[model samples]
Target: RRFTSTFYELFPKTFPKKLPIWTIDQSRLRKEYRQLQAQHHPDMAQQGSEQSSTLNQAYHTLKDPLRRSQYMLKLLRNIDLTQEQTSNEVTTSDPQLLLKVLDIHDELSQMDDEAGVKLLEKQNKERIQDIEAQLGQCYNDKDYAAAVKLTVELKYWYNLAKAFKDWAPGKQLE
Candidate 1:
């Protein structure tokens, strides 16, 4: 509630464009984050100042690819999935994408060895990278709908990869 400004507003120099691109300048973002922190630290400002806090929040939100994509969607389409009702499902209706997701999920569920898990992890990482590249192209072509679809698929792939990487044998529920 204290910070009402958009992430772009907080760091105008870093993100001069209207929407964020897939490839971000990590070094620049970190440099600016440190600069803001130094300038707005509570000790340097009045007690209970939210300047540093706000900057921190913005930095984290923009640093994460998933979070940044969601924010960009809101900025471009005025859609905020985070604020939507829990039952509201915003997913891609692409049959091909859905089938791919199902295939990956089934493969992951049948894994029985560390080798299989590692293989899936590598494959998923590559898939995520490929999707990001496509997403970048979609943005360059000004195809917001395609970008949204890729973003949604990327999120699903990312979560699935994380789950597969974190899986432990004998930890399954009955």
Candidate 2:
């Protein structure tokens, strides 16, 4: 059977319908990935190369939590953020959240000290956790709109946290 149909079809035993609430079995996934690779190795069949490529893509997508969430959203809601106008799209309508995000950006732009960066990193991490919990609830409730909104917001917080983590003590801030 072709493994390019969907992530669920590719990893039928492991793919979680409600992704946010599930903890992935990394070892099992890796084992299955090796099995698929061997099954579809280019020397095995005429179409092996294509099948292997598809299997590789599906494995990587399922391995990443953020990508998995996005893929689940696409499968369940048919909401493709890549095709949507998401640049200026308002993911959250709450004024407080907007103001907080603006404040965070301002702080990030003016970051000078490690203490400030550390504080922001801690705050962002907490917010990420909160959003993750909310996302889990949304998925369990089958509230896809809320899940999408939370995922978008989560992306912002995650990036901000990454920036803080990647920032150096004496480097110029971008």
Candidate 3:
């Protein structure tokens, strides 16, 4: 009431319990975004614009896995991990993750087959989902530190996924 609370508070019906949750039904969330945007849509008043803008910010933060996880950390621990400088370093030292990251790097560097890229993207989506579940468990166990680590790894994976999406041969605007 006093200040802008968490985004989950905006859409109560969509989010079951907005307490650092990673697993969310995106379909329902988007529906809620549409509903709220239209419900509070500009009614010929400048003040009305603020409502929709906040709705936009909230929906986007909740929709993306990395964004949602980081937002949760900020709310619960008051930790702002906005800029992480270790772009090429892995946050967690798990063997599986290390190999997976290396493999991802290798394939993207040495191979650029469209089919390969798309399949890798598909598989990475699953990897992202698995890490998301891990983050949720960390929250349940009050493992904020672990959650933060996963968020960093999540950012790297997301960046790779974006690269896969943007891989188009000879389509560079140079």
Candidate 4:
């Protein structure tokens, strides 16, 4: 099977059911990167050639997180990379997830110092982990509809965490 198709099969649990087609899974892409490198590294291959070099380049793009995200976004036709722009336009419709985001925003906005910021960061990170683990369990149980909901929730937390970092530390007085 083709690379992208194989990737889809490997990560069906993580994909949405409608609209844009499958995106290459970063975790699976990491595995593919290692597998390809093991199979075709110059030392392992019988001979190095242009094809091997091409494989190396392909692996590099898939292995880097930012590059992989960008490439997958392109494949999904959502390639706008500006965070400020995306934030203004992209609205997640999951209500439960939106509640969690509001809670996070309120907690972080109340903090006034670096220590307060760090505490909020740690709490947000833990919450994200809890959500991700919850989603993983839902996916493994073959609850795909629930998995989709959980994934949407998870994405919202991820976005909120990123936006938290963009807040200005010294601008509290302004």
Q: Which is the leading candidate under TM-score?
A: 1
lDDT of 1 by residue, 43-109 (tens): 5643224754466767887887767777777777766645534103446346677788889888877
Error of 2 at 63 (Å): 2.2
Q: In model 1, what lDDT does residue 132 have?
A: 70
lDDT of 1: 0.71
How much is 47 displaced in model 3, in angstroms?
7.6
Model 4: per-residue Cα lDDT over 114-144, one tens digit each: 7887877787778766765664565356454
Model 2 regions lying over 4 Å from their true place: 1-4, 16-23, 38-40, 45-53, 83-92, 171-174
C-alpha lDDT of all candidate models, in order: 0.71, 0.70, 0.75, 0.53
Per-residue lDDT of candidate 2, residues 1-174 (tens digit): 322456656665565462323356778888878877667756665322565347667778778766666777877777765444752364535667767877998887687888888888898888887886787778888898887777777777767877887777775655
Per-candidate TM vs. native?
0.78, 0.74, 0.72, 0.51
- Judged by whole-model lDDT over C-alpha atoms, candidate 2 comes out at 0.70
Candidate 3 local lDDT, 41-141, one digit each (tens): 46544222475346678888899878888888878877766655432343445668768787897787655467877788888899898998898899889
Instruction: Tell me model 3's lDDT, rounded to 2 decimals.
Output: 0.75
Off by over 4 Å in 4: 1-4, 8-32, 38-96
Candidate closer to the true structure by TM-score (higher is better), 2 or 4:
2
